[PDB]
Amino acid sequence: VDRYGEYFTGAMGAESIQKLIENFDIDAEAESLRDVIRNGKGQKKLRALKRLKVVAAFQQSGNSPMGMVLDAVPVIPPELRPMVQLDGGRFATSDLNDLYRRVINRNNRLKRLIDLGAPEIIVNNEKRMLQESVDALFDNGRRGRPVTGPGNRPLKSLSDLLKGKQGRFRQNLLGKRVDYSGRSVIVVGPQLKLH
């Protein structure tokens, strides 16, 4: 940059990938993959087929892949992340609240850094932490070591509300607790008829 800065443009972080997605020809790359498919080079042909599977989806749908880079993150309503009061006077809030709060803290600090004209090292090291915070909010533990809460417990992310037996599906959709239901110990009844 100090020498030939007039000739090229480079960037770091997620904004760089945003710009790369913006400077991307969808149809051209799709047909370039079909060109490789038309010539049977299995070893290097399967790896191109699998790329076409992703690129044609953005081609046909008319929906830009730019959505893979976020400028604003949605916040789930509070009653789905409720903060309850305890009988000891203190409180207890969902882990999603702590994740959202960390995101908010680091984003506001980044705003401060941008206003102050802070050195690029601090601003980039802050954007990295903002990336990690959004990653923890969406799927904590997917990359690297998870964000530990009090007691070395991994915080439950938004995607953790849908995973496995405890997730929303297998716990509140496949199986539900119903009214007009009881339970008790069973006992043989020879007197009773089959019905």
Binding site: G67, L130, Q131, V134
Partner: peptide
């Protein structure tokens, strides 16, 4: 600052 979705 823009951010990437970890799912993708």
């Amino acid at each position: 600052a823009p951010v990437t979705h970890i799912w993708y």
